[PDB]
Amino acid sequence: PDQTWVQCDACLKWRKLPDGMDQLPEKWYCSNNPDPQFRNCEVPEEPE
Amino acid sequence: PDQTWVQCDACLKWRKLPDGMDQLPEKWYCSNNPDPQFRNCEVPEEPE
Amino acid sequence: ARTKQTAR
Amino acid sequence: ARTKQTAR
Ligand SMILES: [Cl-]
Ligand SMILES: [Cl-]
Ligand SMILES: [Zn+2]
Ligand SMILES: [Zn+2]
Ligand SMILES: [Zn+2]
Numbered sequence: 621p622d623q624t625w626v627q628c629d630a631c632l633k634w635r636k637l638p639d640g641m642d643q644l645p646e647k648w649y650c651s652n653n654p655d656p657q658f659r660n661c662e663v664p665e666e667p668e
Numbered sequence: 669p670d671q672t673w674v675q676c677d678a679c680l681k682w683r684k685l686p687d688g689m690d691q692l693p694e695k696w697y698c699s700n701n702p703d704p705q706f707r708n709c710e711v712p713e714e715p716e
Numbered sequence: 717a718r719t720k721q722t723a724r
Numbered sequence: 725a726r727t728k729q730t731a732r
Contacts, residue, residue, distance in 0.1 A: 622721040630709035631678035631697075634720065648717035649679075651699075651708035660699035661678035661709060668722060670729040682728070696725035716730065 631661035679709035 624641075625634040628650045635650060635658050645652070653659045658666070673682040677695045683706050693700065701707045706714070 621724065623724055625720050625722065627718040627720075628678070628709075629718070630676070637719075644717040644719070646717065647710075649709045651710055661676075661697045662695075662699050669732070671732050673728050673730065675726040675728075677726075685727075692725035692727070694725065 628661060633661065633663075633665040636666060676709060681709070681711075681713040684714060 621639050624637045624639065626637055626644060626648050627634050629647045630649050633650070635653050636655070638654065641654075650659055650661050650663070657663070669687050672685040672687070672689070674685055674692060674696050675682050676698045678697055681698070683698065683701055684703070686702060698707055698709045698711070705711070
């Protein structure tokens with residue numbers, strides 16, 4: 621199963637998401653991340 | 669004193685700051701805001 | 717939201 | 725950072 625990533629509409633960094641989730645909102649921000657260690661725009665983007 | 673605002677480097681919204689801040693980081697984000705009600709990019713920008 | 721997929 | 729001032 622592929623790794624899904626979502627782009628923060630503010631900082632444009634890509635954040636990994638767990639497999640479970642379609643049904644994302646139209647706009648998405650780091651602050652919405654289920655992973656609490658990647659939940660603001662200051663955290664660097666994880667390497668691919 | 670006048671009102672200081674700082675711009676989020678990610679979302680480009682302006683945020684009011686209190687008087688007498690220590691020196692700000694080169695890159696400043698909503699997450700860094702001392703006002704806890706304005707601490708992410710999803711909060712709309714306050715009217716001028 | 718804007719998404720992408722990469723192979724594991 | 726980038727900053728501005730407005731009158732109170
Ligand atoms: Cl942020
Ligand atoms: Cl955010
Ligand atoms: Zn972000
Ligand atoms: Zn912001
Ligand atoms: Zn942010």
